[PDB]
Q: What sequence folds into this?
């Protein structure tokens, strides 16, 4: 629809990128309940793509260069207040498009097996994503799925 490049700006945009839904948890085992990546997105050589679907923000997304023809995404919101269209779809579109312009032939993503990812994985597979070697910002696991986007 309409994606722009926002750099640390927009309350609703930053808020969304921060936590819009932030649903409650009904299960939290003792292990590591304090890990996200504060000093990750908020770093150098980083660019945030915004998605505006109309007069209001649709969502945002992050993208960092990896290889000459390899891209990776680590950010995406959906649902939000209560809108239907395809925020992630819109962004995901710019993600692929962005790589398309550059001339990429592969796209990585961070998956596994979560409620927030459950659909995310479906969104990707709906865009043309096939299973492949795991990577993301984690390591393989018995309860984790990974895939790659082939242009």
A:
């Amino acid at each position: 629809m309409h994606i722009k490049i926002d750099d640390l700006t927009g309350r609703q945009v930053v808020s969304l990128v921060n936590e819009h839904l932030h649903s409650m948890t009904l299960m939290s085992p003792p292990e590591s309940i304090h890990a996200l990546g504060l000093e990750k997105l908020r770093g150098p050589e980083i660019t945030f793509w915004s998605a505006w679907e109309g007069d209001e923000l649709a969502g945002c997304g992050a993208l960092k260069e990896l290889d000459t023809r390899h891209g990776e995404i680590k950010s995406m919101r959906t649902s939000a207040s209560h809108l239907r269209k395809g925020v992630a779809k819109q962004v995901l579109q710019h993600i692929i498009e962005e790589a398309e312009k550059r001339g990429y032939e592969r796209l990585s993503l961070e998956t596994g097996s979560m409620a927030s990812f459950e659909p995310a994985r479906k969104l990707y597979e709906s865009f043309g994503f096939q299973y492949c070697e795991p990577f993301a910002d984690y390591g393989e696991d018995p309860n984790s799925v990974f895939m790659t986007k082939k242009l």
